[PDB]
Design an enzyme around this catalytic site. Structure first.
Site, mmCIF file in Angstrom:
data_model
loop_
_atom_site.group_PDB
_atom_site.id
_atom_site.type_symbol
_atom_site.label_atom_id
_atom_site.label_comp_id
_atom_site.label_asym_id
_atom_site.label_seq_id
_atom_site.Cartn_x
_atom_site.Cartn_y
_atom_site.Cartn_z
ATOM 1 N N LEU A 22 23.189 16.743 -4.976
ATOM 2 C CA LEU A 22 23.754 18.060 -5.259
ATOM 3 C C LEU A 22 24.307 18.125 -6.666
ATOM 4 O O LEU A 22 24.682 17.098 -7.225
ATOM 5 C CB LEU A 22 24.914 18.400 -4.309
ATOM 6 C CG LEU A 22 24.704 18.488 -2.793
ATOM 7 C CD1 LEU A 22 26.075 18.596 -2.068
ATOM 8 C CD2 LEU A 22 23.784 19.643 -2.410
ATOM 9 N N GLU A 30 32.284 22.455 3.484
ATOM 10 C CA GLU A 30 30.995 23.128 3.272
ATOM 11 C C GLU A 30 29.896 22.353 4.009
ATOM 12 O O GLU A 30 29.086 22.954 4.711
ATOM 13 C CB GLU A 30 30.662 23.248 1.765
ATOM 14 C CG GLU A 30 29.800 24.456 1.412
ATOM 15 C CD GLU A 30 28.336 24.320 1.856
ATOM 16 O OE1 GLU A 30 27.799 25.320 2.414
ATOM 17 O OE2 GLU A 30 27.679 23.263 1.628
#
Ligand SMILES: NC(=O)C1=CN([C@@H]2O[C@H](COP(=O)(O)OP(=O)(O)OC[C@H]3O[C@@H](n4cnc5c(N)ncnc54)[C@H](OP(=O)(O)O)[C@@H]3O)[C@@H](O)[C@H]2O)C=CC1
Ligand SMILES: [C]C1=NC([N])=NC([N])=C1[C][C+]123[B@]45[B@@]67[B@@]89[C@@]1%10B81%11B698B746B814B562B%10%1143
Length: 186
Positions: A22, A30
């Site tokens: 990411l 999240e």
């Protein structure tokens, strides 16, 4: 399959990946949202199916593959069997969707969740019929080398709210974000 779901977290510059991971530091709640949405099924005897590309599969730490509590299907045009630990392999989204209706998966799959990467999202977002896009807007720019396809606003409507999805701006590790749900019907 009468409906599909996509789920993604995207930066303000539309980034979803950098260097096989990411673009932003890990955001625990999240991630827990992704887990909750893709895992949860109240249909007894069935599980949800996650569909992902090959690079996304290998971006998951080994100890967490396959994603627990979900049937894991990897797309590849080159592999002849699923990567070690994955449950199924298909050559395309349409092949994957057809697979769920054959005897093995017929009575076993509830929701279908498309979990990336870019080419998987692109295909899914043009699939005919009802589709929802669960999009976490990470409210910062992050250097990225993988990006989320454009949301066609002629096709997709931003839902004002969705049951079980928080509406307010969230913040973890100093990074603000918000949960959105889009839908198309045709
Ligand atoms: N922020 C987020 O929500 C997410 C971020 N990520 C990030 O994105 C990156 C990985 O995604 P990305 O680089 O786009 O790669 P993908 O996960 O899409 O993997 C690419 C490979 O998957 C296969 N493939 C992909 N699409 C299809 C298709 N529709 N039909 C058949 N095969 C297909 C091909 O394998 P082959 O070459 O074997 O044919 C292709 O080369 C990582 O950095 C990861 O961390 C990933 C998912 C979500
Ligand atoms: C962080 C996140 N958040 C979200 N709302 N949707 C996603 N598709 C992902 C990306 C993922 B989910 B979880 B972890 C990273 B790895 B594994 B799975 B794999 B895919 B990739």
């Amino acid at each position: 399959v009468g409906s599909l779901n996509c789920i993604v977290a995207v930066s303000q510059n539309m980034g979803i990946g950098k260097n096989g991971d990411l673009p932003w530091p890990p955001l625990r709640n999240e991630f827990r949202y992704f887990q909750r949405m893709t895992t949860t099924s109240s249909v007894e005897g069935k599980q949800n199916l996650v569909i992902m590309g090959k690079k996304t599969w290998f971006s998951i730490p080994e100890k967490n593959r396959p994603l627990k509590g979900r049937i894991n299907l990897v797309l590849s045009r080159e592999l002849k069997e699923p990567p070690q630990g994955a449950h199924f392999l298909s050559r395309s989204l349409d092949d994957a969707l057809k697979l769920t209706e054959q005897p093995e998966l017929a009575n076993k799959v509830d929701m279908v969740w498309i979990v990336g990467g870019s080419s998987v999202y692109k295909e899914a977002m043009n699939h005919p019929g009802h589709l929802k896009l669960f999009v976490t807007r990470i409210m910062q720019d992050f250097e990225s080398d993988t990006f989320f396809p454009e949301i066609d606003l002629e096709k997709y409507k931003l839902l004002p709210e969705y049951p079980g999805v928080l509406s307010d701006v969230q913040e973890e590790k100093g990074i603000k974000y918000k949960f959105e749900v889009y839908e198309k019907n045709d």
